[PDB]
Amino acid sequence: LRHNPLDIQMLSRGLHEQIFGQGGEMPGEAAVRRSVEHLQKHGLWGQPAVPLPDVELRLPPLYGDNLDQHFRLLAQKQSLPYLEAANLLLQAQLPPKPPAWAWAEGWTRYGPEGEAVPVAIPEERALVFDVEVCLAEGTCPTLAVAISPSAWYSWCSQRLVEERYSWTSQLSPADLIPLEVPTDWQEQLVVGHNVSFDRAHIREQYLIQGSRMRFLDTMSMHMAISGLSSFQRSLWIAAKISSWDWLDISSVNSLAEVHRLYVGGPPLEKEPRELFVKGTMKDIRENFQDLMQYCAQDVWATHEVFQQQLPLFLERCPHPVTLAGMLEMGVSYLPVNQNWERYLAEAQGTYEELQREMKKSLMDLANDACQLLSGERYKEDPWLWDLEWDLQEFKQKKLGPCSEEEEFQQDVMARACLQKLKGTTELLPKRPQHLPGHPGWYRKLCPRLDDPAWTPGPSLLSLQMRVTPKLMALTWDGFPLHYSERHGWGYLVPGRRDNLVVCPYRAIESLYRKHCLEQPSYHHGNGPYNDVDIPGCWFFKLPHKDGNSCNVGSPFAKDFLPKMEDGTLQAGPGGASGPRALEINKMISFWRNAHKRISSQMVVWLPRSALPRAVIRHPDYDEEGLYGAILPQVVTAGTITRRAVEPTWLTASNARPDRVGSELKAMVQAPPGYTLVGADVDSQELWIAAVLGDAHFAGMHGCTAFGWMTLQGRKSRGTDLHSKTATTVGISREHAKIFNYGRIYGAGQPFAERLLMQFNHRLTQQEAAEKAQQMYAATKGLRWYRLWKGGTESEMFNKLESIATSDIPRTPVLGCCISRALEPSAVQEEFMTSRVNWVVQSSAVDYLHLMLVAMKWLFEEFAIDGRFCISIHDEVRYLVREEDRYRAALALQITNLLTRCMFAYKLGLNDLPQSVAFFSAVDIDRCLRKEVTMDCKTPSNPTGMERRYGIPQGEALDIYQIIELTKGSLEKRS
Amino acid sequence: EGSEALLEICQRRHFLSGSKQQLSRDSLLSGCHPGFGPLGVELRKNLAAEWWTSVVVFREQVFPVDALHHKPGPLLPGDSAFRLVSAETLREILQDKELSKEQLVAFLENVLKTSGKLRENLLHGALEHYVNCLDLVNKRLPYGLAQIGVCFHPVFGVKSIGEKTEASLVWFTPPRTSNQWLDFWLRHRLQWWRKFAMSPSNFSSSDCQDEEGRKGNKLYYNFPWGKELIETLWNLGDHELLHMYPGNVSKLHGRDGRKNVVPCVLSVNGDLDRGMLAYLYDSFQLFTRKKNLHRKVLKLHPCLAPIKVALDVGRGPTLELRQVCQGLFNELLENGISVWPGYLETMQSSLEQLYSKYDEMSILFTVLVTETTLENGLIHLRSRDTTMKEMMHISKLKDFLIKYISSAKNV
Amino acid sequence: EALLEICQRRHFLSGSKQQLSRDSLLSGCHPGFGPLGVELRKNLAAEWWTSVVVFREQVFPVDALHHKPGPLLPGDSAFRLVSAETLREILQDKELSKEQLVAFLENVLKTSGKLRENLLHGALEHYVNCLDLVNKRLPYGLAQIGVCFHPVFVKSIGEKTEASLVWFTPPRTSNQWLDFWLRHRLQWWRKFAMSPSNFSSSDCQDEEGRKGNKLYYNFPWGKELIETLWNLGDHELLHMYPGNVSKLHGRDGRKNVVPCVLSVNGDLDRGMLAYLYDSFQHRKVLKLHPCLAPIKVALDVGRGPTLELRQVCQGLFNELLENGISVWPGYLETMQSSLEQLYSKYDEMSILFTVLVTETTLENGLIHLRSRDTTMKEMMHISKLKDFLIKYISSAKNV
DNA sequence: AGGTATGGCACTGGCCGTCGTTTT
């Protein structure tokens, strides 16, 4: 209907009729009275909201009697064949290992009692599969071992058996393992440990068209069943604060520990040499049999682990949607073209330039410092007095010119004398010394002449070294810097006369007097630490954004950039040296940390014959261009909350100014004739918590102040919770997200005020404290009413804590069980914050699973030509044919709608507010970027995507525009 | 100021030539100075060699070209350019009374329209070779022609001639990529200038437009008195090429992928004399500890320093020391390392004065031989950058130096 | 002759066919040189510089300018520079015309500037200040390489690239030094030639100046001068510094004396032409000396996968360039011709060795090598080619 | 008590290989 008892615009009449049941029970009088009293007391019962337009859609027919049955049937239909294959694996009888491993190239199947026969492909419905790669030769797969019911299979690479001078560095599908049966039935299942890495080496996985093959990961199921958190992992490894009964039921993600936990018996032994990581191709050739044996051992252990694991997973997560979503999450796919190569170069070179300018600036400062050795002048430098200036002795074992004609004699005599004196090498020690003439501190900075990476001067210097601040003579409020072992970086305040390789304290006092003539210590800051004794001075820690306990590791941290602008942090040379150094550091930090991961991404380029016909004929088909793909190595469940993990693509930064290589995601570009259609959930966890509280309180949407405020705020009007908080405190909305989610999940007031001070440079201590207090007192009150009762969010906190303290906590929507390592019996009250956050985070995981299931169903039903591309914890992208780009958008919106209603249905509510029915915007683009309008200008590409690469702007469309462009139908002819 | 000290140093150590009053800023910038001393010649040669290596050596589509220093034939009337005239041309007209009343005033038209001019830029000569240099690459359109040479500019005697040696590249590109390439070179050249600089920030770039609406870039160096232009990049389109070859256009076609087109012309032109002066100012670096290290030295880049090594002797048996020094001198010279033969000068000063003189001359290393060198073959070595002393065996010296320069390119 | 046609076709001599002739090339009023000619001239200049300047402590570079401003000698023969402003000023208010033509043409000689005719005067203008560098040790020299302008009979202007050495020596030993320099220069000219006998020396005398020598090369049409050595005494040095002679004094055996001047001047363009003629002496090929050949090695690909062979050749090309060997990248053309034509083209360009990379090279690493002189084919491993070429060049130099 | 994940560089410490000096 058009409204609920609290006058909140609910779902349209037609949509509500199509989705929810007609005979929905009405709320009682008492519940409505309580909700109205609550809202009036908080002061929200008056505000009238302007209604939003109405949407009328003839949705595709549903199955079952309600939403839950519909989703269950869809998930079962999706996941039936792969569950059948897993069951086939569970009941397998495997013969013993072959007596000897074959040497031929390709695939060999081992028959009974050792017989070996060459086969093109394993041709099995299920497998346990493992691969090994020679890291010295690059990324080409080296050799693989697979097992199926009643058969062993071995695969040898062409680069392992044959020897040739040159192997191509560009990787084609012809250099990967063939594993897919051509056009005994359609579906195939592959099981492995860290199975994504093995999937990355399959030739058929790189086709633009999707494949029926799916993959299951033993590590993901271990995380689902008995995983541990990072802190728990560290404690578990160190066990070789009060409760410890959880140790015996948990383990780390390493294969050996998993096998010990789920199977036991004889331990698993590694290969001590570690040839595949450190050896060479010849070393692999010589040790063929042993490496094959180890590979087979690992495969067998993984097979046993899966046999033990599967029933427990099926028991602790009984809803089929979880398995369907996990299956769908393992088929990620990223397209790329030749531009990727250029992106690797442009960034790298740029980085080097910014490196060079930095090193040249510091190296020079080092050189002049060497001149201070003479006369012990270094004993007077406030920054360098405490360095190592000792030299080392060199070691040894115990009249009128006239034209001439006989120049040959002079030449030969000089050459002979030179060579005779050259031969006196018998007295030279066999191990050359390393710059004994220079000082020790300068000696450390220089490489050794034998190093093949040698360069002149102290070319190892960097901004992160503890000597660089001394060389730059950094000053803080007119005080020189200093490093203490216990307390990190601080500064020295002169004036002590209680005597608090000797400190040149008079030089420091003179320097401070010079500084002062430009405008029990008498200076106030992080407080003196008398445990550090530097006669004639006090040591004061540099303030840290996380409090006085933490230690500063480098004054050139990004957070110190404003202090440079304010002039509190000043460099000795003066001018723009310090600010420029900090700017360069900020600009190159991300690339410095991530270039090894980014440049080593495995890329396979599809030949022309393997491309779709719709791509060759497109007018945008760039001939002489390269088209390829990258398959992210995502662990479907690498987190206790069952989130995904990827070393590179889940840490990629968005295109940002003044950050080299920030256009990483923009390089993922659809091929000609293809588009990327994507969407992100709006205020996901906020809404989840709000609806949980609403269900707990009175069973109506908006019956709580928190949910009431959450529902109405619009993104376009800038009235959502994030924007309101940002305006109230005066920070970016991105920082507002951090502030709000920190407050929600147990952050204390000191943390919030420190965060505000960090994000708002113009604030002060008292103002930040007041703005934190005026936002922490209203949300929560006192514990209870006997001498969470009061507060806007009290009901939500009570609901979350009730779920957390349950004997077997489960996700309210799908009822997945939390890991055995975090149940109350194993841990009494230890890791409360993690358990509380788990409810909402695993609910978000369930949301992702439901979205994936719905999208797959909609794409299959209406013959939509597209496939899943990628997701990051709340966002989904799809690769679609251009002509269908609009239809897909509609599907996404519908997938959102149902996904919301399901969340209400399992909570006992039979209606959905109109506000959260649809995605605020759906993005249609040709590359991956946060917004469709950004041109992504960075130091690595100044011109931008539009000019350098010719990628035009995308489009963002809402529900009404999509309806106008599609007429509300998903059919291929409207 | 510090500029006077730098100019005095450059005069004393024969970087420049002339007198104090002749070496004014205006004369140096305009190119109407007496000239450069041997050290300046060596520095300019090193700069030109580095430019040639960075522009021509490592590219398969850039070829050398030579343009004559003068342009003969008829000229359009005007432009105030100088005119080349032989001796007897001053007599064969006046004699015989060739209408000696007033027609020899209209003879100024003949003077304007018949006498040749001195080369003003390298662009025209390069464009003159476009057709015949198309055979090298079978008409693969993206390619360049490079040259280094002296050009003459009139400067307000009443009018003098300023000579400037400059490096020019003319790059023919497909039109649809002309802008992209214009960016590329703009970065590439900007890197090169920054490569050898101690303070690469003082090198800057700026966008600019022509009265015809043609994009361009200009590179400037920040001298102590302000920014001065050192290089220019112009996207000239095809107007000049079409005007130079009016007629059948198909003769000018080149290959862009599978298509035949007429290329856009990108012209890059940089001044080598002004670049040398800019590097001289940069190396002198005109903070208590830095101030107290008031040592005069020209910290030129090792790839550009005119002199690499200084060789001398101690006190002892003169003949043997001179023999070993001669051997070392010949060995160092035979492998491409320039040396200053200090051993051939009598003793007149202590080590402090030699260090000061060699620092003012920007010599990378100072080598010292003694009796103990004859005893065991160990020599003393002092480095310009740090001034620290090291002991080293002669058997390795030739290699070490060859390493130090060779790796300097890859810092 | 066929040689000039080959030079035109292979980009040694620039311009069209009609613009090339014996007289034009000898005079220096020809269109110019192609890139191969430019590289050959540069190699010749580098050899001259290393032979004359590098291995001597008392020879220094000099930086003479191309023109001399200010008042000039009246009359005399040379190229003067005229001002268009000084004639444009008459276009608006005539200065009575009539009788001022002869006076104006005399003012032309009075005030006009002149183009450099030789490198001797530029060096003489640096003698006094360059004497400081040697602490007045009288024996020492100044060397330069540069272009000079010569009238040629409407008079035309010819440009010649020349190498000049000015040697100041005590008058006692001037003749001995003249003989020494004659010997050394003759040896240097004979060094790179396949037929050293075609280089000859002769003695000559002048009314002004002392004994002198001339160096000639025997082109097919006769002997042509390529270098001249003169013992000019001290007339010019005094004439440039009238009156006082105390500054002009230099040291010799602890006594001061005014030095005698020896002038050596050689023509680089004519020398390049002579070497081109020398090398050409039933297969058309230029056996230019390895130290002077503009291009050392040519590279090409065989039949096979284009990307792989192109990557291999790119790596080899980068490696060869990094070590100082000039390379002709023929692999970019995709080998659209037979092998005989390719060999003929590379021979006419005077390339020392031809390198061919085939698909078979991907297997074991063997490339085909052809030699310009012997024409014998060989198989060599890629890893050894660079060192082989470097050793070959070194051996050619040492002999 | 924010939660969950990922990774890199700088610095410290321990072990073991290998050399040159000193005994026999």
Place this chain on the structure above:
DNA sequence: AAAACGACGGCCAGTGCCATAC
């Protein structure tokens, strides 16, 4: 001429801080 021994140097492993994503 062969063996004990004290020192230097390179690799591996570990801890801390900082920087990314949601």
